């Protein structure tokens, strides 16, 4: 019963979803484009159960594992998208990118002495900002102008949203069956800030 001991473990299994994830992005090559959408599916109705329904037992460790091998399949499009367009080691540039982010500010904020409780109203709409035209993408593509504006607030949105959750790790009392969900939640912020950073690096080195 330590926040030494529970912060360890959680980045244990944070590191394995990241390593799971990247195995289903090597399998998600093969994967036909038309299952992309149903699993697209499968993993907002993943995210509904973990998060967004009152539940009296936490998700478990299968659970987590299974999103993150799912997840990494349906990242292949975009991923593939910008190693066309841009280059195979943008790729490598944003996914690096995402980890000094994520050391840089998930160090300051666990390490904070303030409570940052208090952002929970801004950063939740400022995602749901970033959802709505995330959203008028999906069905109209935006230019080079104005999609580099949508990639660069998703940067700093969701690099606070690092610090934000990893801060309220140290000062929310974090049990031992939330591990799980908390490891996907670190999962999800890694992945919308390295899909920006992706956005972000590919239309800096892109042809047009």
């Known amino acids: 019963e330590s926040k030494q001991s529970i912060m360890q473990r959680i980045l244990t299994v944070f590191v394995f979803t990241l390593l799971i994830a990247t195995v289903g992005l090597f399998i998600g090559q093969?994967?036909?484009v038309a299952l992309?959408?149903?699993l697209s599916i499968l993993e907002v109705a993943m995210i509904i159960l973990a998060f967004?329904?009152?539940?009296?037992?936490?998700?478990?460790?299968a659970?987590?594992?299974t999103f993150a091998f799912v997840?990494?399949?349906?990242?292949?499009?975009?991923?593939?998208?910008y190693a066309s367009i841009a280059g195979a080691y943008v790729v490598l540039?944003?996914?690096?990118?995402?980890?000094?982010?994520?050391?840089?500010?998930?160090?300051i904020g666990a390490k904070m002495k303030k409570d940052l409780s208090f952002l929970w109203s801004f950063l939740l709409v400022a995602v749901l900002a970033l959802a709505v035209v995330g959203i008028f993408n999906i069905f109209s593509p935006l230019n080079?102008?104005?999609?580099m504006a949508y990639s660069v607030i998703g940067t700093i949105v969701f690099s606070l949203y690092i610090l934000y959750d990893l801060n309220q790790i140290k000062h929310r009392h974090i049990?031992?069956?939330?591990?799980?969900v908390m490891a996907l939640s670190l999962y999800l912020e890694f992945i919308n800030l390295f899909i920006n950073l992706l956005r972000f690096f590919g239309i800096l080195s892109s042809d047009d």
């Not at 967004?52 to 460790?61: D, I, L, Q």
């Open 30 to 32: 093969f994967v036909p």
């Open 36 to 38: 992309m959408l149903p």
């Open 52 to 61: 967004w329904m009152r539940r009296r037992k936490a998700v478990g460790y």
């Open 63 to 65: 659970f987590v594992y």
């Open 71 to 81: 997840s990494g399949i349906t990242l292949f499009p975009i991923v593939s998208h």
């Open 93 to 107: 540039e944003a996914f690096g990118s995402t980890f000094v982010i994520f050391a840089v500010l998930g160090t």
């Open 144 to 147: 080079s102008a104005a999609m």
């Open 175 to 180: 049990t031992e069956d939330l591990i799980p």
